[PDB]
Amino acid sequence: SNAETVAAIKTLIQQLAQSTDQFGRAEINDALRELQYSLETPFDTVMRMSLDTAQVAVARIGSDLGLFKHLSQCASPQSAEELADHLGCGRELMSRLLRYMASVRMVQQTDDIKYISSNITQTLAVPGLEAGMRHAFENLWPVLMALPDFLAERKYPDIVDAKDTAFQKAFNTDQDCFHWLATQPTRIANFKVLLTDERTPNFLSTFPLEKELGSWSAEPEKALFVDIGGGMGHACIRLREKYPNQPGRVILQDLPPVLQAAQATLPLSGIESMPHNFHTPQPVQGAKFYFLRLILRDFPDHQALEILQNIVPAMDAESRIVIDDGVPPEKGARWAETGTDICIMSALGSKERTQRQWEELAAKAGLQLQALYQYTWPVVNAAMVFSLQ
Amino acid sequence: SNAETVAAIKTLIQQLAQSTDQFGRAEINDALRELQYSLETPFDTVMRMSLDTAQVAVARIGSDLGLFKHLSQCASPQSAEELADHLGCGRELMSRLLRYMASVRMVQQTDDIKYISSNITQTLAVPGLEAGMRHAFENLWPVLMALPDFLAERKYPDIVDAKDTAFQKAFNTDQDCFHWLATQPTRIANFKVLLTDERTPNFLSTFPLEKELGSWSAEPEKALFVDIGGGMGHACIRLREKYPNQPGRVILQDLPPVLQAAQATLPLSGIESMPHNFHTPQPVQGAKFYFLRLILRDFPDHQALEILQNIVPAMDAESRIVIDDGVPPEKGARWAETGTDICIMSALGSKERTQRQWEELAAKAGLQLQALYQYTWPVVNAAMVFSLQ
Amino acid sequence: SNAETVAAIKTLIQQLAQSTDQFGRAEINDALRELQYSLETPFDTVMRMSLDTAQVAVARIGSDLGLFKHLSQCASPQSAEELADHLGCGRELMSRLLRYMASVRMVQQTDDIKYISSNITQTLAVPGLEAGMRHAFENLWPVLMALPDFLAERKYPDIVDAKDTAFQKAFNTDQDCFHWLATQPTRIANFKVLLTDERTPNFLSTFPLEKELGSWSAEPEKALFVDIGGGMGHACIRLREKYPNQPGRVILQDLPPVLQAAQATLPLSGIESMPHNFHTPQPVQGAKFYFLRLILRDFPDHQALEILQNIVPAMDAESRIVIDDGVPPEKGARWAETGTDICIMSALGSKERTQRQWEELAAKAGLQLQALYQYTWPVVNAAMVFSLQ
Amino acid sequence: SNAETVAAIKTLIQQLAQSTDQFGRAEINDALRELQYSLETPFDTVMRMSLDTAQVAVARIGSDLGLFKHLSQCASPQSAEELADHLGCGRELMSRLLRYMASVRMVQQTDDIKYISSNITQTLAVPGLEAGMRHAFENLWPVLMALPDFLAERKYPDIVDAKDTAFQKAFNTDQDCFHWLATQPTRIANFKVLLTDERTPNFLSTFPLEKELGSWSAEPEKALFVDIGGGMGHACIRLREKYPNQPGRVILQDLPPVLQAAQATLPLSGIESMPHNFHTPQPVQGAKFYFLRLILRDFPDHQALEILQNIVPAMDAESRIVIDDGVPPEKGARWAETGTDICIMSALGSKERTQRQWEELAAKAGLQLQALYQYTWPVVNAAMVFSLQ
Numbered sequence A, B, C, D: 001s002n003a004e005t006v007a008a009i010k011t012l013i014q015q016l017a018q019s020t021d022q023f024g025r026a027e028i029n030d031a032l033r034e035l036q037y038s039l040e041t042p043f044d045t046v047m048r049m050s051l052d053t054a055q056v057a058v059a060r061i062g063s064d065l066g067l068f069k070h071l072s073q074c075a076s077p078q079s080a081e082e083l084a085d086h087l088g089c090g091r092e093l094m095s096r097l098l099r100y101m102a103s104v105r106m107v108q109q110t111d112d113i114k115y116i117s118s119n120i121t122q123t124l125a126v127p128g129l130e131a132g133m134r135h136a137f138e139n140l141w142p143v144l145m146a147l148p149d150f151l152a153e154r155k156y157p158d159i160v161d162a163k164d165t166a167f168q169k170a171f172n173t174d175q176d177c178f179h180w181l182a183t184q185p186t187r188i189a190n191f192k193v194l195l196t197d198e199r200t201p202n203f204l205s206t207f208p209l210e211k212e213l214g215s216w217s218a219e220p221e222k223a224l225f226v227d228i229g230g231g232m233g234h235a236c237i238r239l240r241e242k243y244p245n246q247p248g249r250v251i252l253q254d255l256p257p258v259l260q261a262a263q264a265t266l267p268l269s270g271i272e273s274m275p276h277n278f279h280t281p282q283p284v285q286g287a288k289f290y291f292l293r294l295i296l297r298d299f300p301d302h303q304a305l306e307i308l309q310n311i312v313p314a315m316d317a318e319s320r321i322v323i324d325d326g327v328p329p330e331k332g333a334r335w336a337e338t339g340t341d342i343c344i345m346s347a348l349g350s351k352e353r354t355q356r357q358w359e360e361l362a363a364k365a366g367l368q369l370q371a372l373y374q375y376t377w378p379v380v381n382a383a384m385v386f387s388l389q
Ligand SMILES: C[S@@+](CC[C@H](N)C(=O)[O-])C[C@H]1O[C@@H](n2cnc3c(N)ncnc32)[C@H](O)[C@@H]1O
Pocket: A195, A228, A229, A230, A231, A232, A233, A234, A235, A253, A254, A255, A258, A276, A277, A278, A279, A292, A293, A294, A295
């Protein structure tokens, strides 16, 4: 019986998944995707490419309606009619949207054709994750839609410049993406929510802080950690939480509106908020660690180099620049790494970098790699520790 | 060993897939997708929604470049430099595209970082399947991209009309999709190729023709099968192939440009080509089977009903209208069924129909359902046989 | 001078023939024949009956040899020796054949006893006209040769039946001519060519189509013209050519081998090819004109009536059956009209019909004559337009 | 007006014909045929070749019925019904035959659709002319029908032998025509009637008998005229009628059954009947004239030479052989001359001979041409007078 075989496959893979850790589950999930692609028929391939698109659009609709937030807090299954009436949606439209969502696990459909939250419902109700889905829809999809014709009309150039990539066609502007976004209020607002999502795990799970510090001393008034473009300051918060008695200043640097949004959730003491544009010379001199997490991936080499060159003059011999970012392998890179690469190429003109490419970029700033501490698998994120050459 | 467990899952799923038939494999693939969604983390969900989009754009680029056709005929692994030079693509752009393609099995990457075709490479080289992927990119994506704001601006109406749906916003026209496409030569050419893609399996795998014929006589000169909107005439070709000894006219009806396209590959004898617009009265009288495959799903009820009403006056008591189309269940419909429903709502104003919904529609034309012969699983396609009431 | 008077008669008859049109020339030629018969001596009459026979046999020989085609493309006079050597004929036989041919204008002999093409040479080089001469030799001659003894043996019956006429004696078969010919591949090939001979002028020279159409609507998708037994479709081609702006389907109906032959020279669009045996019910409903040209003369009344009865149930009140055929007068009929009558009696058991005889036949099928449009003189060919009674 | 023009042409040609003599009328008749052929259309040519055939068959039917003899003696116009009842013919068949006959002047149709004899009716009632038409039907038409395939299968030989020509295929025999006919009683009987038709004019109209005789003397018991194969003896009869007091025996030679048929109409004295086969040595020695009229045209050169070589040994210096036969011109020969040539080639293996060819044949027998006396025009018949070399 097919039904019996399929249910047995689900039972065994669930049991294997439960018994491993997050990294093993990620490896199982990638293997299931690989199996799906290897076993699908030719028309399956076309249907999946034709339709998987639609999930982002329907998630955006559900977010517009407040559906996921609402279903996440309901105590009993809801009919489509109840949901349509509550959320202000046409009843037939609501019913068709809910059936589609149930088929892709965005909600769950009961045996009496009512609706309850799934894992994905709960995810899409979390503000920062909702904001990620909304960002994919309004910022990533237009640049991906523009890329094929952008490349064709330009005879397939190597993209190297933030002011000359698919973004400019997609949004009919000569501005680079970051400059243009900062002129668009609703888009800015969605980004500020996006910063509230903290990734797990983080570099402190494998970073040997004591070993890296050695005998370093914080007197007088030296900084232990300068978080450059630190956003809500999650790295500063976690560092103070794990090492509450390490001396040295811990400093969150970002632009004033971001530091303003961070104040609500910062500890009342132990972390300084310091407005600072990372395209300008670094004000804190001789800090132990200058930390750049998910910063330099967003810039082509020329601009990423300029960001590093604003920091290096502030370093002393004990200073390190810690780049915490993706470090895809030389071969066999996974879909999240390469898909990121194609997206940031299209929007920002930038690229993912292997270890060798990070080293080549850093050497242009007069830095050499001392240590690399990976903390996620199988997609590689690592804290790369650089010193002056 | 984590790697060892994942490789054993792959081996056992591959062997179970070989242990069954195409319908069992379709059920296994749906289960693999369900498992992926149930085991992904919240961040994973957002990453998958953000990036799976990119596959369609990158397939479109590969198609523009002729990459899939070229790789599918190579006799050895090719480097990225070789492919770039051969196809006229920037070397770095080509390398980054190939790495992305390999991570989603659109090509395979070898251990020495060269590239060979995968099953998906071969699919995307086939003109009718390539044309489906191109159709998704250029026609389906824009209407899905317009849908959330269309609904928001109109306060979530029930879409009922081909002239008032997302298509009009997507393409800035007051025409309906069918009327607009006929003005756009680029899109027309791709549709021409798309019509050459024959789906498999087809209704003749389960249709009990001799049972349905009973004692019908083709004498004196009656028509056995009238393929209304039959496209390239695949249904007529397969009927004559499976039932070479059954007498009766076999008639392909379509518009003149489509008929002229069909001539190249129609049998030299045995199948008539008859120009006929199915919005006008059916000219062939007293045929045994009037066949409508993937026609009525493209029309809202009012228009679908008109197409049926144009056939009914030609029927005698033995005639049947055979609707070959999707028949999703009352609940638990699969993602290809509900995704189709949302896409055709957005582009055409139409809908997928359950068995009860088909019966209500056909009852309005004076028809009753005599039999239903499913021929695909788990997504339901079936030949529904209707008689006069 | 005797010679001078004869040459002056030739000059004046030639100038009068140029002074008039094709119908006046046909009347002059009939008068010339009448004069010949009235002025010949009794011996002359016997000599003419004994020898005029020979022309058909000698034309058949010239056709076998390819003589007419070859002479028609020669740029200078040819001697008998040159032609014999070129065509592979005995020299003395060739010389004697050419002298005979020149004496009956099948070629012309020059003053230095060489040969050039005449009008008749050119005619016999044309495949459809050559095929008519070959048809006379191989099909008509044997039935005429059998007729006197057939009648004598059967004590001069009224011939009424296609299965009981001279044809059966001539070819020693109990089949009727149409059934027997379809077993004889040599004769079939010649008939194929014979169908390519288009007669001129045709009914459209005098048929008042717009008058006969009145306010008939081709909407929604009605048929303007159904050419029943239309052969190569010449009537359909000329209709579309003279009336390029009149809407309505134009449909050529014949048997499949004839339709396949017609495809080479049919327009690329505008004329449908529909296989249809005219002994079965007419499938096209409500056409304006159902056209039968040179069909019903080949059938005795019982069978001609059946062909008409197969059309009548398809007619609506505006439909007309148009019989395009010979309509000889009540008296004074010309030799081509009565000769046709005796030949088709002998081969097919059928007959020429006067206007009153056509009306009696059509009345048996429930039809009435609305109009008659002659288009040749003095031998009467006319498009007779019949409606429902 | 066409009718007025045509009637004026008939009036003027009739008046011109009446005012000339028989030779001028023959020239007018040939010119009318030539005009007909030069002015006919291509399809006219085919129709005339298809149909003029039928006249011989219908004349044969009329002869079988006794129609022409009967109508020739009726005193008033007869209806078709009256004729059918009187002659034992189906009424509808009779009516169709009479309409056909009237259209080719074989009878005349009155304005009230009754029937009276024409010139041709009277001709076909004369026994010997009737027998000529019957001979054309039963003997000439089968050999002409066999000729094209006979020549094709033998790759177009020069026909030179009476035992190897179309006759043998036509009648499935290895006999020569004369030998075969003498075994067929009805055919023999028709030939004996054929001999009763006397041609006009004859050679005595221009033969200068007195000049050719000079001083020749009939004593003792010498013959003036020996008519070899003389048939009914018309030449002997006319010679005695024109020169009743020329001395010398006048001797009719033929085979016994022909001499028997001649007795009824020979003068009771002055002409001897002498059985003699002209393939055997001539018994009458030293006659003045040995006369061969329409004999040698029926034999190929070898046999014609043998006939002459049986006569020459009987000649003295004053003897002449007089060949009275066709003498076609070197060029421009008329249809009756060349058609005769093709017919006797096909039946007898023989040929028409020009003056030069007669001289070459006669020289092989040791004869030289002394004088040639033509007596018909434009088709040449002449008495050619030969002496010993
Ligand atoms: C991708 S978010 C990374 C946040 C943080 N490093 C983390 O991982 O938790 C990029 C951050 O860079 C900040 N940023 C952008 N442009 C900046 C600039 N010119 N100077 C300083 N910060 C900037 C943004 O405000 C945002 O907080």
